[PDB]
Amino acid sequence: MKFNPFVTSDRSKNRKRHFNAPSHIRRKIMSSPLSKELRQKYNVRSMPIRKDDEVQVVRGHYKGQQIGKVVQVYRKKYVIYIERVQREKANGTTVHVGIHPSKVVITRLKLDKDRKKILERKAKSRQVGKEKGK
Amino acid sequence: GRKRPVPKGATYGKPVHHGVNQLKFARSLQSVAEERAGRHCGALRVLNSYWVGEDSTYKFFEVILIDPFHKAIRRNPDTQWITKPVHKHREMRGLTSAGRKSRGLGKGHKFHHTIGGSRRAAWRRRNTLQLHRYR
Amino acid sequence: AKIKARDLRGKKKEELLKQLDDLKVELSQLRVAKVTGGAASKLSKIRVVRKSIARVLTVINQTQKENLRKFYKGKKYKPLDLRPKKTRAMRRRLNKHEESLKTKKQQRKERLYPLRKYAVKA
Amino acid sequence: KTWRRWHRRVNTTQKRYAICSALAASALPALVMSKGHRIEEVPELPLVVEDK
Amino acid sequence: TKGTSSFGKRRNKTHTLCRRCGSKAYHLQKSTCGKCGYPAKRKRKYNWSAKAKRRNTTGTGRMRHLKIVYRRFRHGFREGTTPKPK
Amino acid sequence: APSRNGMILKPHFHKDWQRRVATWFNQPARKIRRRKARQARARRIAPRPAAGPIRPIVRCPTVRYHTKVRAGRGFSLEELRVAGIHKKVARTIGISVDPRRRNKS
Amino acid sequence: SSHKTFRIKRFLAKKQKQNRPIPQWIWMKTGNKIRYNSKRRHWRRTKLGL
RNA sequence: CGACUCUUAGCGGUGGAUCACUCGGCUCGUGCGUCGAUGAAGAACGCAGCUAGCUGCGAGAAUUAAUGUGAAUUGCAGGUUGAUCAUCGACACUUCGAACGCACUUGCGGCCCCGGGUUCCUCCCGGGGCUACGCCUGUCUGAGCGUCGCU
RNA sequence: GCCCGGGUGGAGCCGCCGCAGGUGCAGAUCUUGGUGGUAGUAGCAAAUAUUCAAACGAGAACUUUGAAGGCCGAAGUGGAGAAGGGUUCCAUGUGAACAGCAGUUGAACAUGGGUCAGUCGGUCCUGAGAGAUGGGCGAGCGCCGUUCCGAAGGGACGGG
RNA sequence: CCAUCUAAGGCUAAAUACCGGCACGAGACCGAUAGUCAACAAGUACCGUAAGGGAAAGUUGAAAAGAACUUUGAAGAGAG
RNA sequence: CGCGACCUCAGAUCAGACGUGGCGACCCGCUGAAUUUAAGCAUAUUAGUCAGCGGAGGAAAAGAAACUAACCAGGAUUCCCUCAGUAACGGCGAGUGAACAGGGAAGAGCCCAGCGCCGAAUCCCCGCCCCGCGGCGGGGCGCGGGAAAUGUGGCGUACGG
Ligand SMILES: [Mg+2]
Ligand SMILES: [Mg+2]
Ligand SMILES: [Mg+2]
Ligand SMILES: [Mg+2]
Ligand SMILES: [Mg+2]
Ligand SMILES: [Mg+2]
Ligand SMILES: [Mg+2]
Ligand SMILES: [Mg+2]
Ligand SMILES: [Mg+2]
Ligand SMILES: [Mg+2]
Ligand SMILES: [Mg+2]
Ligand SMILES: [Mg+2]
Ligand SMILES: [Mg+2]
Ligand SMILES: [Mg+2]
Ligand SMILES: [Mg+2]
Ligand SMILES: [Mg+2]
Ligand SMILES: [Mg+2]
Ligand SMILES: [Mg+2]
Ligand SMILES: [Mg+2]
Ligand SMILES: [Mg+2]
Ligand SMILES: [Mg+2]
Ligand SMILES: [Mg+2]
Ligand SMILES: [Mg+2]
Ligand SMILES: [Mg+2]
Ligand SMILES: [Mg+2]
Ligand SMILES: [Mg+2]
Ligand SMILES: [Mg+2]
Ligand SMILES: [Mg+2]
Ligand SMILES: [Mg+2]
Ligand SMILES: [Mg+2]
Ligand SMILES: [Mg+2]
Ligand SMILES: [Mg+2]
Ligand SMILES: [Mg+2]
Ligand SMILES: [Mg+2]
Ligand SMILES: [Mg+2]
Ligand SMILES: [Mg+2]
Ligand SMILES: [Mg+2]
Ligand SMILES: [Mg+2]
Ligand SMILES: [Mg+2]
Ligand SMILES: [Mg+2]
Ligand SMILES: [Mg+2]
Ligand SMILES: [Mg+2]
Ligand SMILES: [Mg+2]
Ligand SMILES: [Mg+2]
Ligand SMILES: [Zn+2]
User: Fold this and answer.
1) What's the CA F14/C1' K36 distance, rounded, in angstroms?
2) From the CA atom positions of chain D, what is the Rg in Å?
3) What is residue F105's three-state secondary structure?
4) CA 20 to 30 Å from C2, out of B25, C11, C63, E58?
5) DSSP labels for G8-27?
6) Residues of chain E with a CB closer than 8 angstroms to some CB in chain G
7) Ligand 33 center from residue E49 Cα (angstroms)
């Protein structure tokens, strides 16, 4: 149960903050879990999604064992687009269907210097937390 | 004195408020003079005033003012209180010696009207309901 | 292609003004091209030229005022621009020295009878 | 109006009486079960464990 | 005659735009604004109309300097210094 | 209008009493704030007594209470002088001092 | 009136510029609730004050 | 039989009730408690590739610099030595407005210093800096058959 | 008042023991919103008047052109301004809404354009008047007063 | 006779007040004719010469996937 | 007549500063009604309230007795409980209405003028040198200027000195 008096548990306040968070909070919010192999390798559970990571779709009409590369991340709509998930409209042109990152798992990451810095920081903090828990 | 500024007579209302030309101002002429001097010289601070002469139709007062931003007083520890912002327009807020006399300030059985800050404060304290949480 | 403020700082005023003039004439050409009908590529460049002009002007002003206040730091009277800019009320408070100094009578009193640290047994 | 009588005061003796009555009733299996608590396996409802 | 026929004669205006408050209340003949009292140094404001007071109070406009000082205050009016460069 | 039988009452609600009403919904918060300030000062003065300076013995000045004994405002100069305490040093070593009080007895 | 002051002409210019309809690419943004310009003024109906 | 009228039901209209939702209120409490001639509050006019309103901003005009963050913004186009967001300490901040050269038409000036005409010899054009009231301390220039002193 | 069945609907709801209330409508010429009969009714009647042919067009009593017959009759139903209006002006396009019938038309809607001054006015002068300073009054924001209880000229030929 | 102060000069924090402002937390409150007038381009549109007066207006759908294409009509508007 | 002091009073785009206006929930100083109640109404009441004017701060105001009491005496101001709907006022009608003591929250005391003594022992400003200077200060040097004896500073204020 929350005991900090300076953080709110009000439903309307939380929803307002969620729906008007700025883009650099949207990046934090739209994070998705790593695969089992990546989790065991990096000792990290979740990672904010980037432009060209690939994904397994876990829930929804498009769940399956297809590795799909993300094409772009629409933070305004809280959505990512995957190069394989898509549907054709009336005229026949094909448009991407939005998938929320929370229903998404990374197969392997795009290892940029900032990405590996973030991974090492997360792993170090988790390991020191576990060592304190010892 | 002070006659009521009403058009001809016409202080419309009940007869108890029909008076025009026998009323008296609540503040003294010394206080009026200090406030006039302070209003004219808005960059100075009024300290005190004294009587220097009078006649049938005039009263003459000399009033001391202090320039609060002069170094000669800003560097003197015991007179730099007047340079504080709290002491702006003492004559307009009735804080000088002459102005205080009209407020009925005092200690003892003669001055029960101003227990607390002033008449306003005493009236407020006496005219509210203390609706406690439990009652 | 991209004009940045990091590498404009070391340059002196003359070539900064020259570059500003080149940016201005480029912006004028962009505007006339926009009116007579130009490519979307040329239309988009208007914002980047405007922002480059803003960067150059900002660097010029920053260096100029830095030099001015560096030159004026050693003088009693400064321009109102270079004087500290906080609230009008705080600008006319007693400064630290005239707020801290005390009359020597009080100095004598607090020297003769200072506060003591003590405790009493239960 | 905000000055409605929101709060009430109860006598201290009455509060202590209510506390005593609640404590005494907590020791009767019939009342505890009728409160809905599942204690059919509890060895002894005045359940006491050591200070460990 | 006192109604529709008379309504046709009105072709010269009493008020114009005020140079201070911007409303169309500057009486020309009296050369005085009926909303803010422009020639007077102090603005016209009576508290027998809270609606009028709240229509043009401090929180209504741009607040282009008070808004800035409101956030400058949260750092003790820090001035003359910059964050450490990279 | 009076009913059959009862008391004549004079409720003092003929003014605009509803504008000047003091609700006490901040009473617990006030108590908490006073406590916090109390402990803050107690920590501030590290070994000194939390209550403050000692005070003197006085008799209540009335036929109703002259049998009782209060805590006074401060020790008077006659008592300090006959106890061998300087009026200026008493305040800084923890004795409350006032010069108004006399000593008839 | 043909005779008019500079500030009157400027105010008229701003009011005239404000009278255009909305761009067609507005109504199909994402977070949009605007269907049309509801502040359009016609010279016969509303007389601009002044 | 047919038309018309009435009643009940099905369906379809008209209308927008009810229900369920709620980035909004109301009330209570907490900490702080800060505007302005270094030009406030307020108003006006402008600023987006496509922009009317709302919002943001001020000729550096939906923003510059700096710091943090770390790959977007998005309705369509266009183009990691750091995109976008946030913070905000540097810089900038049009016209009115206590509003300040005089007046409020944006009309008419004065003084000083620069650049064009000149090649200062004056006009003319452009640019920059001053030109409000009251009041304090000091400076300078004064006035008085005011009180005196030497000639 | 309630419980079931059937239909629609798409995300929350109720029983019992207590607690609390902004807790039950037929009316108040009640408030807001909606809808009837009246009723396809009253009405679309002030200032003499229209007709023929063609074109465009899905569509013509009303548009355009040509012809005829009329009216305004120079104190006009003509040609220009002031005040006021503020883009209504011009060209092209449309016929959803508006122009109380209709429209191929419009002062409607939608895209674009359009106002060029030493000499035409403002700008200057003063009129009736308005209004600062000095002064006076005023608790006070301020008010009176316009030469009146003012050291009210910052100019100049010339000479040094 | 007693009692008690020493006027006509000055400074001074804390306990106290707070329907404005900044930033927060909560509720046996209201749930779009309610709750602020204002959940929405609201002190907005609009009215009055002016002082001033002052609204109406929330909900497709999980995702626009917002109905390609054929056909009648000038089109609105229909059938597939 | 002239020259020179002092006094009083002017002029400045003289050097350097300061005020104006806004918000106004809370605060201080003025001015200040009538609805209403009295089953009418004029004194009263509404009410020293609304409206009006002025002036601030983060709180304001008040404040260290020309006090309360009459006791075996208390001891600045402010705030809460109680005193108390009491003493009292009132066409003694309607109505209005405190204070002391007592328990608490908090708690902090001081400074001039005068009387006198110290060679004005005092203060402001300009120039140069040294320190850091984004709350313009400290030290030294100036036969630098001014204020001030029509009184600046040290001692000192009712608790005595
Ligand atoms: Mg935590
Ligand atoms: Mg009075
Ligand atoms: Mg007296
Ligand atoms: Mg005012
Ligand atoms: Mg009865
Ligand atoms: Mg009874
Ligand atoms: Mg009309
Ligand atoms: Mg039916
Ligand atoms: Mg625009
Ligand atoms: Mg930047
Ligand atoms: Mg960056
Ligand atoms: Mg004119
Ligand atoms: Mg749903
Ligand atoms: Mg309820
Ligand atoms: Mg009904
Ligand atoms: Mg008919
Ligand atoms: Mg004509
Ligand atoms: Mg014509
Ligand atoms: Mg036309
Ligand atoms: Mg029609
Ligand atoms: Mg010509
Ligand atoms: Mg006048
Ligand atoms: Mg005394
Ligand atoms: Mg005193
Ligand atoms: Mg005081
Ligand atoms: Mg809580
Ligand atoms: Mg509803
Ligand atoms: Mg609906
Ligand atoms: Mg009656
Ligand atoms: Mg009557
Ligand atoms: Mg009366
Ligand atoms: Mg009275
Ligand atoms: Mg008032
Ligand atoms: Mg003020
Ligand atoms: Mg302040
Ligand atoms: Mg004070
Ligand atoms: Mg004393
Ligand atoms: Mg007392
Ligand atoms: Mg009793
Ligand atoms: Mg009687
Ligand atoms: Mg009374
Ligand atoms: Mg007492
Ligand atoms: Mg205590
Ligand atoms: Mg002396
Ligand atoms: Zn105005």
Assistant:
1) 10
2) 17
3) coil
4) C63
5) HHHHHHHHHHTTPPPPTTST
6) 13, 17, 24
7) 13
